Amino acid sequence: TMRAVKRMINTHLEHKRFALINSGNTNATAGTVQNLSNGIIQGDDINQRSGDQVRIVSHKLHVRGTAITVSQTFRFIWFRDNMNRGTTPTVLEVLNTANFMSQYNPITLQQKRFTILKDVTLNCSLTGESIKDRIINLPGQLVNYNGATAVAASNGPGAIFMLQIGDSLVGLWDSSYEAVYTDA
């Protein structure tokens, strides 16, 4: 009667929820890495956690880019850091070179330091569609923490991040994120 137990088990666990929004950021040619799961801190509220582990049932990422001054490209890489030891990964840890066209870092991907959840490229044209967006929903996994508060040192194995990189410094991008998780 397997799989039916999975259903019953989850009906006894509270599905806590955490929402985040990050608007009006500039496109970055050298790229940046944004925290997504870090915001769930130790506490008793619906968007907090008990202990240093949570299990994401599902999470959703919404990304948006707006071209300014020149038509440009925005790339967003949603990823899981399977081996985080209390840091916010650098762009070069994920990409071979710090360029929006770069392929993944051969070494970190070989050893599975990261798992790419979604890699999205939005081309925003000032002579066409200057505003573009994408929403992605995916089932989640375990998230471990190394601390209680919303600081880099608290990120742990399973931490969720988003790398943004593009070919201009003038355009603006927005993002929002939601995680539904159990905390038993």
Partner RNA sequence: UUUU
Q: What's the CA angle centered on 126, arms 125 and 129, to 5 degrees?
A: 50
Contact letters for its own copies, residues 61-90 (x by CB under 8 A): -x-x------xxx--------xxxx-----
Which one of residues 26, 48, 57, 83 is an interface residue with RNA (CB under 7 A)? Answer: 57
10 alpha carbon, distance to own chain's centre: 24
Residue 42 near residue 135 (C-beta atoms within 8 A): no
Which one of residues 25, 26, 32, 130 is an interface residue with its own copies (CB under 8 A)? Answer: 130
Q: Is 12 in the site for RNA (CB under 7 A)?
A: no
Which one of residues 22, 48, 53, 58 is an interface residue with RNA (CB under 7 A)? Answer: 58
Contact letters for its own copies, residues 19-48 (x by CB under 8 A): xxx-x------------------xxxxxxx
**183 in a known ligand binding site:** yes
Q: Which residues does 110 contact at the CB level (< 8 Å), separation at least 6?
A: none
Q: Is 112 in the site for RNA (CB under 7 A)?
A: no
User: What's the min distance (Å) between Cβ of 2 and RNA?
Assistant: 6
Question: Which contiguous run of DSSP H or E holds residue 4?
Answer: helix 4-11
Give the amino acid at 47: N
Q: What's the CA angle centered on 85, arms 80 and 91, to 5 degrees?
A: 55
Q: Is 3 in the site for RNA (CB under 7 A)?
A: yes
141 binds, among its own copies, RNA, none (CB under 5 to 8 A by kind): none
Give the amino acid at 71: S
User: What's the min distance (Å) between Cβ of 127 and RNA?
Assistant: 39
Q: Is 8 in the site for RNA (CB under 7 A)?
A: no
For the segment 117-146, give every residue that binds RNA (CB under 7 A).
139
Residue closest to 53 by CA, chosen among 158, 149, 151, 130: 158
Reduce the secondary structure of 50-82 to three states and give it as a string. Answer: CCCEEEEEEEEEEEEEECECECEEEEEEEEEEC
**127 in a known ligand binding site:** yes
Nearer to RNA, 24 or 139 (CB): 139
Query: Residue ranges for the binding site for Ca(2+)?
Result: 14, 44, 50, 53, 127, 183
